[PDB]
Copies of this chain bind each other. A is one copy, B any other.
């Protein structure tokens, strides 16, 4: 109704992606089970993940108080200076280590750090703060067992896209606030995340069927993730209710121009900068939310990967 004509305003590069047909796929099951929707997502993501760098990969199950969680280690080189944990997006209800395969492999290539993807339990089966607890547990397990796994856990980082960016910064804040040391958090890489705004200029202007980010869609994802309405205000969900004026690790904040969540990125950055916390913001012109997946076809997506990777290594 009052929204911007986003499909006309996106870049010609972004449009080539949006207009790409995958003719071998069924239609999107908007009335199937969550289990079917997850399967479709995994199938549809495969084409975008093709051509990923080839490198040494290892999969391990790690213990958590909620049971074992799968992890995948991508090891570019034998003397990694740090370990980067990667939390994938998908609205908390979709996505896995395969949907984000190419992103995690390129991050490893461009950083020359070990990248560890965490297969956190999705919602609605898991509810807040379960994923964050699983991530912290995994991190802490790897830190205790670093020698056995052959990884450098002296310096770590958290990285993620969309809902995974929320998990990335919430994990770093959880570690800080609970006085948990599972390695020095050298940096956090946050591509088009959301951090607890309930409304904003960008949420009003943007969002539609092309990105699955209408007000209604956002309420749906919140309803799946939270168990109690009181959790809306938790400082590990509404991160703006946490104290962002001190002791935040260096954050690289990437905004998508035509994403309703962009203001979440601008508020985090403006908050951090006003309180002299180390950060950088960069807007990627012409993009929709979720663009990091499109690095093979979009120079802007590969640039965003390079930029985060390089921000991380600049902290080491």
Interface residues, chain A, CB within 8 Å of chain B? 1-2, 4-5, 197-201, 204-205, 240, 243-245, 263, 266-267, 270-271, 274-275
Q: Is the CB of B263 within 8 A of A200?
A: yes
16 more contacts with CB within 8 A, not counting A200-B201, A204-B271, are A1-B245, A2-B240, A2-B271, A2-B275, A4-B274, A5-B274, A197-B199, A197-B201, A198-B198, A199-B199, A201-B263, A201-B267, A201-B270, A204-B240, A204-B267, A205-B270
Partner of A205, one of B4, B199, B243, B271: B271
Smallest CB–CB gap between A222 and chain B, Å?
13
A266 to B1, CA, bound (A): 18
Q: Which of B2, B5, B266, B275 contacts A201 (CB 8 A)?
A: B266
Question: A239: nearest residue on chain B (CB-CB)?
Answer: B2
Q: Hey, which chain B residues are within 8 Å of A199, CB to CB?
A: 197-200
The 8 Å CB contact of A244, one of B2, B4, B270, B275, is B2
CB distance from A273 to the nearest CB of B (A): 10
The 8 A-B residue pairs with the shortest CB-CB distance, nearest first, are: A198-B199, A199-B199, A201-B267, A2-B244, A201-B263, A200-B200, A2-B271, A197-B199
Whether A274 contacts B197 by the Cβ 8 Å rule is no
B197 to A267, Cβ gap below 8 A?
A: no
Q: Give the residues in chain B near A244, CB-CB below 8 Å.
A: 2
CB neighbours of A200 from chain B (8 A) = 197, 199-201, 263
With contacts A198-B198, A199-B199, A200-B197 taken as known, whether A267 is within 8 angstroms of B1 at the C-beta atoms is: no
Complex interface: chain B residues within 8 A of A275 (CB): 2
Bound: A88/B78 CA distance, A? 70
A267 and B270 CA atoms in complex are apart in Å by: 18
What residues on B are CB-neighbors of A2 within 8 Å?
Answer: 240, 243-245, 271, 275
> In the assembled complex, which residues on chain B have CB atoms less than 8 Å from the CB atom of A274?
4-5, 205
With a CB–CB cut-off of 8 A, which chain B residues contact A4? 274
Compute how far the CA of A133 lies from the CA of B107 in the bound complex, rounded to whole angstroms.
Answer: 59
Subset of 8 A-B contacts with CB under 8 Å? A1-B243, A1-B245, A2-B271, A198-B198, A198-B199, A200-B200, A200-B201, A205-B271
